[PDB]
Design a protein around this nucleic acid. Sequence first.
RNA 1: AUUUAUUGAAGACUAACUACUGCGAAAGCAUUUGCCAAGGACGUUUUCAUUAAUCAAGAACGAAAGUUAGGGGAUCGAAGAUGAUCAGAUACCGUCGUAGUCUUAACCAUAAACUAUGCCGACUAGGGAUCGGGUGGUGUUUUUUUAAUGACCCACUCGGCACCUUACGAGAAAUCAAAGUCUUUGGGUUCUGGGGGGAGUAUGGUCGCAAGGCUGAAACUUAAAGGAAUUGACGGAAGGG
Lengths: 150, 226, 97, 81, 127
Amino acid sequence: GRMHSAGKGISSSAIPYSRNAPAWFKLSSESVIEQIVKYARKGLTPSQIGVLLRDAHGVTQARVITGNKIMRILKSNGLAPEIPEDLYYLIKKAVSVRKHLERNRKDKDAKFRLILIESRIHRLARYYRTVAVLPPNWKYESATASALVN
Amino acid sequence: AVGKNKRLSKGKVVDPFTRKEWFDIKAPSTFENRNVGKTLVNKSTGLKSASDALKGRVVEVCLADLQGSEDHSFRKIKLRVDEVQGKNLLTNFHGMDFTTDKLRSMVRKWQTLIEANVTVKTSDDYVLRIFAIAFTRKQANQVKRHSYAQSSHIRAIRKVISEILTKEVQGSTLAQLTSKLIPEVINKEIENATKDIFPLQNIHVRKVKLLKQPKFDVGALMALHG
Amino acid sequence: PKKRASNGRNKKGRGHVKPVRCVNCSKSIPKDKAIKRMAIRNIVEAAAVRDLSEASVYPEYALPKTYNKLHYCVSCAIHARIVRVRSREDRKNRAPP
Amino acid sequence: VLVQDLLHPTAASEARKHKLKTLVQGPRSYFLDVKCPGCLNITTVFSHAQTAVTCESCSTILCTPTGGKAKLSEGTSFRRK
Amino acid sequence: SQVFGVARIYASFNDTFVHVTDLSGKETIARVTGGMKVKADRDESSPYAAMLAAQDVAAKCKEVGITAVHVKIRATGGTRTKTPGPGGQAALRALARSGLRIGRIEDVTPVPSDSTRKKGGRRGRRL
RNA sequence: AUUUAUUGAAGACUAACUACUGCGAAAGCAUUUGCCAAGGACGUUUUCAUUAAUCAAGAACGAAAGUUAGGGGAUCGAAGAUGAUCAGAUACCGUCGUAGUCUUAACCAUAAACUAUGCCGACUAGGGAUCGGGUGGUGUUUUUUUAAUGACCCACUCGGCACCUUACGAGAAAUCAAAGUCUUUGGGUUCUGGGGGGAGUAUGGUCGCAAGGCUGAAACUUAAAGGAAUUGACGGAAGGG
Ligand SMILES: [Mg+2]
Ligand SMILES: [Mg+2]
Ligand SMILES: [Mg+2]
Ligand SMILES: [Mg+2]
Ligand SMILES: [Mg+2]
Ligand SMILES: [Mg+2]
Ligand SMILES: [Mg+2]
Ligand SMILES: [Mg+2]
Ligand SMILES: [Mg+2]
Ligand SMILES: [Mg+2]
Ligand SMILES: [Mg+2]
Ligand SMILES: [Mg+2]
Ligand SMILES: [Mg+2]
């Protein structure tokens, strides 16, 4: 794998066999759900919410404590982003590389890496457009992208 | 070959050692000896004022002969003549440096060479470039055969060496710096500070060069030669 | 045919290694392909050792050394009997003698 | 070896493997309950934390993140939950 | 009781220099080279020419007044050979046996930190 | 003159450390430090949920030499000027030396650009080293004798650059842990070849200021050209008797 590199690493989470977890956990579904939407109200993405629930609170993973997933909880409570999280992070990585390239033109490596970053952006944008979470005619172009980051 | 010269000049002698005189060279007081040897200039004729030709001479001389012991045998000391008074011409510190064989023996392979240098000014306004070298070492019980450092360790060690050199050279004058360089206390200060980062044997302070000298100010020079 | 598995050099994972000059003929050779030796010698060569030891102003003197790392091209190392041609079975020996 | 029980490996040999290369993959991490000096305030902290987890009563920071397992602060008393 | 100069033997290939100076190195006594003692371009760097030059430098430095010498043996250096030529050990042993006293032998061959370019081309000196 | 000493200027390079070691898509990358973005592996009871593999068209980078226009021009040095060697020697050797070598803004787009081994995936033998991360060990050592640390040691694991031994197997062999799982012939996909010359030539396009790059035949000619090993013979190769 590692589609834009030669790396072949196997490092991922190995989630447990019990889909109903963890039998030292006494809290209720509504308490962790209000915790989730409180974290979302102060502007945190589902990844950071899950990290905070995993470490500070004991929440093994939110799909097995509650019924649904963190993004579904946010979307149902009305705090869903206009563009998905991985697309947003790839666009802000691209805007950092373009600002550096404007400053330092002689960075051919940055030019190469920018081509890779924008290839990943177009692959996600094609997928998200094909499931209609982005409207068709959503296009990534650089002068729009510097502002879609805010 | 003696006979191949076509012309010695394009165009077309009295003994020169009678005309010269001796002069005894004196070390500053931060050295166990003073008498390092003798030097020659012309007689101070009416046009020449031979002391003035004799001012700018540097004599490099081993620390063993200045200090008596033979443990300093691999360090040389440059002594600059700084005033002439009556046949016993008076010198001053101009620079330490190692010898080629000592440095070539220290640097071996399957270990990391670590260098640092700073360009720091002292209390009496000389500008010094101090060089330091160090080399990684194996532990006892170590079975792998190379013992390299991990190149952030080197960066941290070089930071600690630079901060120690800068701290010691401000707040020392030069005569204090020579009396610090003789017993090797800087080497022990470096080894005390760096043992908690990596083992790092052979922690010698390499050459020191004067880069800019302040104005003459004869009283401090005469303070050395008692 | 391919004579050596290592291509006669030591380069697995670079693409380029910056070259050195032969000490004998000034031929440019990659640093991994060279024939590096290390010439460690006393300066007085063991025949003048008694004359200088009795001529010294010092007792107990060190008799110091010269250190040099010699870099040889393949042609000069073979011509100077530093390395020589070995048998097919004996080329695979990497140990020094 | 040409005959072996692939369905019932020994406990030692399964403990030697990587977490994904075992028979059924599962985490080797765990949770701890950590008690901070002073106020009792038991709190559950993940073993490989990635965050500077603090107890709600006071800034009495319980673990620091590292490349692997979190380093628990020195006066702390943990139990493996 | 002993008065010192320094000896400064530059023993390259193609010639050999014996050049005594004072301890400061500005005042020169008895610079005699190898080629000043033979009748051929070949033997300028011979050990025999080296010992004759060292003998005659020993004579002139004793009659000047120098009794002992600090010896600095040197090769060409730069981007050239760095091993000493054939006349080095000959000159050293000759000024040792002549009656001068010896001290503090050192090598002063100028070694570069990645010098400019060696001559010869990338194919070398093809002969 | 050469040689010695004290300083100064210039431009280039980054020795020793330097290795069957590291990073980079390749070309390539070795003084210190600061800034600017980037990346792999590891860890992970985080998050999305098929978003993937390979790739005509099209695109970014691409050693050296070369070109255009400025700067800079220390060293080496195509051409050239010369001194030898030689039958001849505008070659090898020696002394100089222009362009170049360095840099900025543009081109060029080739190399024995090589591991002469396309990329992705699964399975099939052992072994010991090492590089990066993690885990475990009341393990040594340093420091506040006790602590974390750091550096080592032992065991395991993930990812890497490789190496050694077998020959399950493969192969024409040399050899190969992939060049195996291929007449018991089907995991996915892209590119190239079809006897040797003529020939990477003509011609037509197309890119380039040029030098040239990329596409690219035929008439005709030929019975071999070639690969890997074997035994001799020879060597201005190394040893022995
Ligand atoms: Mg891909
Ligand atoms: Mg994989
Ligand atoms: Mg052959
Ligand atoms: Mg290459
Ligand atoms: Mg260096
Ligand atoms: Mg390294
Ligand atoms: Mg010519
Ligand atoms: Mg090819
Ligand atoms: Mg494969
Ligand atoms: Mg490891
Ligand atoms: Mg490994
Ligand atoms: Mg690797
Ligand atoms: Mg053949």
